[PDB]
RNA sequence: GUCUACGGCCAUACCACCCUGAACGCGCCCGAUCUCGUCUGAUCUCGGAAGCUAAGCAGGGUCGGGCCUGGUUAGUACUUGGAUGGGAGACCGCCUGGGAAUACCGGGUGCUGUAGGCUU
RNA sequence: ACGGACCAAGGAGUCUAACACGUGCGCGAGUCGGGGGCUACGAAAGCCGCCGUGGCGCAAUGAAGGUGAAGGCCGGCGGCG
RNA sequence: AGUAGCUGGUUCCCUCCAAAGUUUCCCUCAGGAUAGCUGGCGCUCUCCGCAGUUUUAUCCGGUAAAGCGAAUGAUUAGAGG
RNA sequence: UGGAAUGCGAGUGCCUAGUGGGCCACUUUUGGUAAGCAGAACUGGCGCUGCGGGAUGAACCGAACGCCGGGUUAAGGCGCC
RNA sequence: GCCGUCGCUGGCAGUCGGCAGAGCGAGAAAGAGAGUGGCGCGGACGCUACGCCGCGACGAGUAGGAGGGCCGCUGCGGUG
RNA sequence: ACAGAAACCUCCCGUGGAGCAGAAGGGCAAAAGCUCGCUUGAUCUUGAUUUUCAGUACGAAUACAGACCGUGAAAGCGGG
């Protein structure tokens, strides 16, 4: 029941990244912010939540 | 925002900057996070992060 | 006095402001367009479908009586499995009473 | 900001009747109470119909109430209407009927009472059966108004039997060009 | 401004393929269509009678009528704000039995089957199609030879 | 790519996908220099795609680890074989550096191509790094340090922390 | 194994040349009174059966042409989306994904339906 | 680009007829006295039904002459076969 | 108070929704009619359906590329007959 | 076992103003040597729209607005202004 | 935190008082049901229901539309 | 033979490089071309449909249906 739990969860509203984004307009592999940062999503979660 | 990216950022329920959601991965999901890749920054959450 | 001649710029957005909706798919679609001779024989078939009614019951009630000789011939751990049974408001009422009496 | 669209945020249903009469604004009070304090989706429909305009609750005929109460099974039930119960002079026999409507014309009260049926009101109904058990909700024909004959596909269009707005109807009132296959065409 | 010709802009759409000219095969004429058949349109240019208009070449629809040399089908046409349901009398040579519904049928019958069975054994089988899931974990055996080492090549102005 | 911070030195191996034809394909090790494994796997796929008819989807990364230094306390001489693009053409180079780590010398090579040739971190393509014996070096800027009794003074010791004494009486001294 | 009639997909079946075809057939062939048609019984139609696989036809062959299918070409060309990337531009690189076409080099060279024969 | 020195007052989607839809009200297969008549505010209000003539609604269709809005089973008789 | 498709004005607050310069026809191109987009009033249900989305099957297409020892057309050079 | 994923209450009916001069940008793109030129395609904007940045600015980067306190950012920045 | 709109087609007539018994927020479709046999006289507020109360989400705007004005002007029938 | 670059006859090769009234495109080889035989479906009459489209007309066109016909041994084809 993942579909149902995730649809019971109101989408999280997070604050601005404390410290600050690296660069919003370019992929993470381009030394930016966008895209997939597989392991490193938690470093952003800690400074955003 | 393009309309094709605005339809997917609202089937992901991300109608607002700094919104977040959980997503189970498959072909039909990765192929949407590729359409909306320049607008999101997704990854694999820890257990402490969840 | 040359004026812009033609464009489609905003059109793909006016189309979607009220959506682009497929037509109303109903069952029992109309029979307009079908060929005359065929639809004339289908009308002659409907006009006389009643002619075989008293013979149609003789079979429907038959296989419905036969429905009688049809059917009347055949006729994660022990811990959290016991706790998920004690914690049932109805099924666990007596495993709960057995505990309430337990402290006397 | 959020990227939602407020085109349809305001639902347009009727929150209350538009009339200002006080024998209706008291019925609507009693039925709004029953609607919220009971779990019967009958009272909610009666209330939602007590809001509706005079064109959405049309009159019923005595004959249509006959043939809708003759259907097998629904005997000894009370025929509830929210509009009015008009007479139907082209019916000769009238049974006994328990009825509850807002109005009953002075020549249908006669027939029903001489037959021997009861004519309740909505307060009598609410006291007889609060949850509305033993009732038969009805509503008159809505497309009966002549207005619904001009609606649809516009006239002068292949296979659009829609009535046009004309001063009078006659030989020489919109019968010449867009109707004759001879003079021009027809649809 | 262009012209409104019935056949403007079909030099490649209605032309026959390379070395596929000449007589049209007969399997085109000896196959049957019944009301409800999902048919896709592909205007063949050899036969001129009953040719579907160019705006339908490539669409799918369902049949609703059948005459001697032609059927009538109901294809959806997106017209500038909306999607009308249009009824065209396409001749038989401009039609194929679309094998799209086919796989859905061969999955419906396979479901009805696997539900008939697995009903006496009390088990529970999966009847839905699941998306290709993330590949599970595996061991990659490096039996013997270590992984070959790659490196970029220098540049060579081979122009 | 963007040569952020200090680059790490990663060892990534990876193989194509198993198929009916190739029941098991050969593994392919590469030696990437990038800020973090997320960029290292992407340069591994850039390279594998520029060498073999192989894409990220059609394959998989078998191992992505950081390889440390075998003697980070010995001054070494690294020689690198560049391959980069200018505004007009593309050229191969060979540059030498004195550093303690290989990733250190590679960071110094990216900052040196950036300084001298204004080459952004994405035009450059390291193709071979190798620790060279001090008697095989060629650049005199690196041969000049191959002395056993090296000796030199710090001749112009420009005053830093110019703002802690910001308003002072005495004038600064530069001889030391 | 194979042939005849009617075929299905219509070159892996087509084109050129060469070699071998038992038996039944398939053919060539022999005639023109009758059916029919011509300058002409050549063709067509008709009545035949002395002669023969010569040819068609069948099978095989060719460092065959063609066709079919693979590799290399080539993660190249091209390409969706992206950047306050580069360049004065002309254009170019990079991230995220998709991804060709020659030349060149290999393999293959008709499967098959119903009915009826021969191979007793 | 055009109007405008300053202040006051005046100043621009009105009324009638028709039509359509929506809405409230009364009566409801009917409905309406608007014209006419009878009985200070009142030139109002009330009333008339043998004053409902007439309008609209209750039937359409045809250019017209005209026509004008479910049926079924059952026997018994004649006819075809 | 002639007409004007043309110019200029068109008077208090708050709340809510919110465009178009596009299609076809017009002695039409400084304007209309029409479809679109907008608002208003609702109604029938819910308390299966739908989607400016992807996935999996399945058709469609002659652009980018590529080709001229492949058809059409253009076109350089030798060599062998 | 309501037969892929994710999301979301939908369907329907009247009446309807304003509009029918557009312009800019990424990419493709026609005429032209080109043009802050003429003309198209897709999407986003300005018009109808403030705010921070780009000294300045219809259209560029960020980001869209009830009135306020604290905290954190985007795009841009941090010798002095 | 405050104002407003929208939605919940949300809740409240139960103020049921010495003719009394003060409840319906709690994970699990349905009765704090009936019968049938083994002293001190006491208890805030509410409810113009066109009223009151509770929850979330939302809040730009020309042309245009709609609503609400215990916003304003002058006269008429009532009423203070 | 006269006969020539070019008359007429004959064999062979010939995927259409010809022709199909016109512009171009598409299509066409026991044919859609060429030559003969018989003809008038280029006739009468209902509605449906497509193309432009508002999804209105006109024009043109596609599928039938009812008649009468032509052709051909027929299957069929034909209302330009
Ligand atoms: Mg801070
Ligand atoms: Mg907001
Ligand atoms: Mg032998
Ligand atoms: Mg002969
Ligand atoms: Mg031979
Ligand atoms: Mg950008
Ligand atoms: Mg002026
Ligand atoms: Mg002046
Ligand atoms: Mg004034
Ligand atoms: Mg109107
Ligand atoms: Mg009315
Ligand atoms: Mg009249
Ligand atoms: Mg005037
Ligand atoms: Mg609105
Ligand atoms: Mg708004
Ligand atoms: Mg004008
Ligand atoms: Mg003007
Ligand atoms: Mg083209
Ligand atoms: Mg090209
Ligand atoms: Mg204009
Ligand atoms: Mg104008
Ligand atoms: Mg201009
Ligand atoms: Mg321009
Ligand atoms: Mg403006
Ligand atoms: Mg303007
Ligand atoms: Mg806007
Ligand atoms: Mg803006
Ligand atoms: Mg500037
Ligand atoms: Mg607002
Ligand atoms: Mg022939
Ligand atoms: Mg006929």
From Swiss-Prot, chain C:
The modification Phosphoserine is found at residue 30. The modification N6-acetyllysine is found at residue 32. The modification N6-methyllysine is found at residue 4. GO terms for cellular component: cytosolic large ribosomal subunit. Coiled coil: none annotated. Residues 1-32 are annotated as: Disordered. GO terms for biological process: cytoplasmic translation. Keywords: Acetylation, Cytoplasm, Methylation, Phosphoprotein, Repeat, Ribonucleoprotein, Ribosomal protein. One of its GO terms (molecular function) is structural constituent of ribosome. It is found in: Cytoplasm. Residues 1-25 have a biased composition (Basic residues). Signal peptide: none annotated. Belongs to the eukaryotic ribosomal protein eL29 family. Component of the large ribosomal subunit. The ribosome is a large ribonucleoprotein complex responsible for the synthesis of proteins in the cell. Component of the large ribosomal subunit. This is Large ribosomal subunit protein eL29. The chain holds residues 2 to 117 of 245 of the full protein.
Swiss-Prot record, chain E:
Signal peptide: none annotated. Keywords: Cytoplasm, Endoplasmic reticulum, Ribonucleoprotein, Ribosomal protein. It holds the Pfam family Ribosomal_L21e. The keyword Flavoprotein does not apply. Component of the large ribosomal subunit. The lineage of its organism: Eukaryota, Metazoa, Chordata, Craniata, Vertebrata. GO terms for molecular function: structural constituent of ribosome. Disulfide bonds: none annotated. One of its GO terms (cellular component) is ribonucleoprotein complex. Gene3D superfamilies: 6.10.250.3260, Ribosomal protein L21. Belongs to the eukaryotic ribosomal protein eL21 family. This is Large ribosomal subunit protein eL21. The keyword Cytoplasm applies. GO terms for biological process: translation. It comes from the Eukaryota. It is found in: Cytoplasm, Cytosol; Cytoplasm; Endoplasmic reticulum. PROSITE patterns: RIBOSOMAL_L21E (PS01171). InterPro entries: Ribosomal_eL21, Ribosomal_eL21_CS, Ribosomal_eL21_sf, Translation_prot_SH3-like_sf. Residues 111-144 are annotated as: Disordered. The gene is RPL21. It comes from Oryctolagus cuniculus. Component of the large ribosomal subunit. The ribosome is a large ribonucleoprotein complex responsible for the synthesis of proteins in the cell. Residues 111-122, 135-144 have a biased composition (Basic and acidic residues).
């Amino acid at each position: 029941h993942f579909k149902e739990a995730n649809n019971f969860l109101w989408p999280f509203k997070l604050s601005s990244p404390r410290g600050g984004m690296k660069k919003k307009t370019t992929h993470f592999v381009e030394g930016g912010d966008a895209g997939n940062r597989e392991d490193q999503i938690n470093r952003l979660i800690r400074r955003m939540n | 925002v393009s309309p094709k990216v605005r339809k997917v950022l609202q089937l992901l329920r991300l109608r607002q900057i700094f919104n977040g959601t959980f997503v189970k991965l498959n072909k039909a999901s990765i192929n949407m996070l590729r359409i909306v890749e320049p607008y999101i920054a997704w990854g694999y959450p820890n257990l402490k992060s969840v | 006095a040359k004026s812009k001649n033609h464009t489609t710029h905003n059109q793909s957005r006016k189309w979607h402001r009220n959506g682009i909706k497929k037509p109303r798919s109903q069952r029992y679609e109309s029979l307009k367009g079908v060929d005359p001779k065929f639809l004339r024989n289908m009308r002659f078939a409907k006009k006389h479908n009643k002619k075989g009614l008293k013979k149609m019951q003789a079979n429907n009630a038959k296989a419905m009586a036969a429905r009688a000789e049809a059917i009347k011939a055949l006729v994660v751990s022990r811990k959290l499995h016991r706790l998920a049974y004690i914690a049932h408001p109805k099924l666990g009422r007596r495993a709960r009473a057995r505990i309430a009496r337990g402290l006397r | 900001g959020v990227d939602i669209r407020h085109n349809k945020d305001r639902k347009v249903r009727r929150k209350e009747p538009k009339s200002q009469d006080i024998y209706l604004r008291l019925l609507v009070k009693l039925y709004r109470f029953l609607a919220r304090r009971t779990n019967s989706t009958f009272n909610q429909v009666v209330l939602k119909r007590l809001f509706m305009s005079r064109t959405n609750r049309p009159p019923l005929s005595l004959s249509r109430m006959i043939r809708k109460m003759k259907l097998p099974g629904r005997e000894n039930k009370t025929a509830v209407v929210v509009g009015t119960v008009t007479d139907d002079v082209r019916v000769q026999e009238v049974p006994k009927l328990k009825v509850c409507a807002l109005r009953v014309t002075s020549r249908a009260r006669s027939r029903i009472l001489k037959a021997g049926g009861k004519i309740l009101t909505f307060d009598q109904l609410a006291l007889d059966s609060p949850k509305g058990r033993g009732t038969v909700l009805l509503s008159g024909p809505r497309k009966g108004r002549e207005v619904y004959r001009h609606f649809g596909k516009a006239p002068g269009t292949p296979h659009s039997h829609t009535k046009p707005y004309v001063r009078s109807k006659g030989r020489k009132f919109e019968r010449a060009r867009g109707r004759r296959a001879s003079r021009g065409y027809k649809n | 401004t262009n012209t409104k010709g019935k056949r403007r802009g079909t030099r490649y759409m209605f032309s026959r393929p390379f070395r596929k000219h000449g007589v049209v095969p007969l399997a085109t004429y000896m196959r049957i269509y019944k009301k409800g058949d999902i048919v896709d349109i592909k205007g063949m240019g050899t036969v001129q009678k009953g040719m579907p208009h160019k705006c339908y070449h490539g669409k799918t629809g369902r049949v609703y009528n059948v005459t001697q040399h032609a059927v009538g089908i109901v294809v959806n046409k997106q017209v500038k704000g909306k999607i009308l349901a249009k009824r065209i009398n396409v001749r038989i040579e401009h039609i194929k039995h679309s094998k799209s519904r086919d796989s859905f049928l061969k999955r419906v019958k396979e479901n009805d089957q696997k539900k008939k069975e697995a009903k006496e054994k009390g088990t529970w089988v999966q009847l839905k199609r699941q998306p290709a899931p993330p590949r599970e974990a595996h061991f990659v055996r490096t039996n013997g030879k270590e992984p070959e080492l790659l490196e970029p090549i220098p540049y060579e102005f081979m122009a | 790519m963007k040569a952020s911070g200090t680059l790490r030195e990663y060892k990534v191996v990876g193989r194509c996908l198993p198929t009916p034809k190739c029941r098991t394909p050969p593994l392919y090790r590469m030696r990437i220099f990038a800020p973090n494994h997320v960029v290292a796997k992407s340069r591994f796929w850039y390279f594998v795609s520029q060498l073999k008819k192989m894409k990220k989807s059609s394959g998989e990364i078998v191992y992505c680890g950081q390889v440390f230094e075998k003697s980070p306390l010995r001054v070494k001489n690294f020689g690198i074989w560049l391959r980069y693009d200018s505004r007009s053409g593309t050229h191969n180079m060979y540059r030498e550096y004195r550093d303690l780590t290989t990733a250190g010398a590679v960071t110094q090579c990216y900052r040196d191509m950036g300084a001298r040739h204004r080459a952004r971190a994405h035009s450059i393509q390291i193709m071979k790094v190798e620790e060279i014996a001090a008697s095989k070096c060629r650049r005199p800027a690196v041969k000049q340090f191959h002395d056993s009794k090296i000796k030199f003074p710090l001749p112009h010791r420009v005053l830093r922390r110019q703002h802690k004494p910001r308003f002072t009486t005495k004038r600064p001294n530069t001889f030391f």
